[PDB]
Structure formats: structure tokens, C-alpha cells
Amino acid sequence: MVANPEHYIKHPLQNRWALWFFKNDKSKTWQANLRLISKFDTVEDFWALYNHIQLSSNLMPGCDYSLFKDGIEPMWEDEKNKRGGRWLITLNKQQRRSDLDRFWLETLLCLIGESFDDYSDDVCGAVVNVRAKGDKIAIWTTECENREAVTHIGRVYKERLGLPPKIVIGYQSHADTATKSKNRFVV
């Protein structure tokens, strides 16, 4: 009689997120090809978007999805990414059907669930690149000199995906990727 079961129509997330899509439309430049699909700030709206969008393993080669916090564009040029970098995970051709979709959904849940605790503010978003040569998934962070935040993020993320502990993943600064002719950290 006292303890009435309570329920909620919406369950807000701690941050608002935006899903971006990149298509290699050869009539446009790189930046013009990076477009905002939609924003969400609740569990219900995340699942409504995820269940009704094309899987990463079904995208054409050269396409990308990105989930970034509201106000952060998924590019090195953004103020919140300029001094940052990314933890990069590389997949071979065999892993497209077996790992890509599982890894990306686990990455999305990692982000929206704030799995990095006190280093949550260092997280900017994640990107999945679908490529014929090999797929890639990355988590983008705001400051490549914050070693404690970067390595905590990397360690929690690598363990979450269930990656074998013997093969390392690297963290590349965006300033180094933008000038490539090199990893700052490994985990």
C-alpha cells in the first residue's frame, strides 16, 4: 500500500549525444561529407535510433558512423579534439561478420553509459570506419597530455570489448595523425 511501484516514461542519459555519418560523396570535400543524422539524450531515443539504422557491417566501404557529445564535431579541427587523440582498434576482413557490430554497439553503450567514471569528461566520442582493407573503431579523447585519463580510458575500453590482452592497441595524437609521413601510448 505504501510502496507503489514507480516507473518513468523517459530515462535521461548524463550527456546529449549526436550520431554523425560520413559518406565518400566524391562531389564534396571531406568536411562537407561529414553530416549530423540526429541527437538523443534518453535511453528510449538511443534504442529507437539504433534499432532503426543500418548496421556498420552493412555500410558501403568508405563510410563512417560517429557518436560525439553534443557541441563536438567528429573532426580534429573541433576545439575539443584539436589537442586530443584516439585509441584505435584494427579489425581484419574476417572480423567484419564476427566482431564489427558487436564491438560498435559495445562502444556506443560504453559512451552513453559513462563507463569511464571520473575521466568521462575527457571522452569526446567514437568513430567506426568501414573499409575493404580492414575496419577500424576508435574512442576520441580531448587531451593527449592527460596520461592518467587516456590510459584509464584505454584499459577500461580494451577490457570491455574482450580483446586478447597480448595484442596491444595504440593511442595516436590527432596532431600526429594530421602530419603523418606513431603512437603516444599502448595498452
Whole-number Cα distances in Å, 52 to 48, 100, 156: 6, 18, 28
Residues 6+ apart with CB under 8 A from 151: 185, 187
What residues numbered 61-120 form the site for ligand M7G, per CB under 6 A? 75-77
- Asked whether position 141 contacts ligand M7G by CB under 6 A, the answer is no
Q: State yes or no: 173 annotated in a binding site.
A: no
- Asked whether position 170 contacts ligand M7G by CB under 6 A, the answer is no
- Asked whether position 50 contacts ligand M7G by CB under 6 A, the answer is no
Q: How far apart are CA 81 and CA 76, in angstroms?
A: 5
Least Å distance, CB 65 to ligand M7G, is 12
Whole-number CA gyration radius for the chain: 17
Q: How far apart are CA 152 and CA 146, in angstroms?
A: 10
Least Å distance, CB 40 to ligand M7G, is 23
- Where do contacts with ligand M7G occur on this chain (CB under 6 A)? 30-31, 75-77, 129, 131
Annotated binding site: 30-31, 76-77, 131-136, 179-181
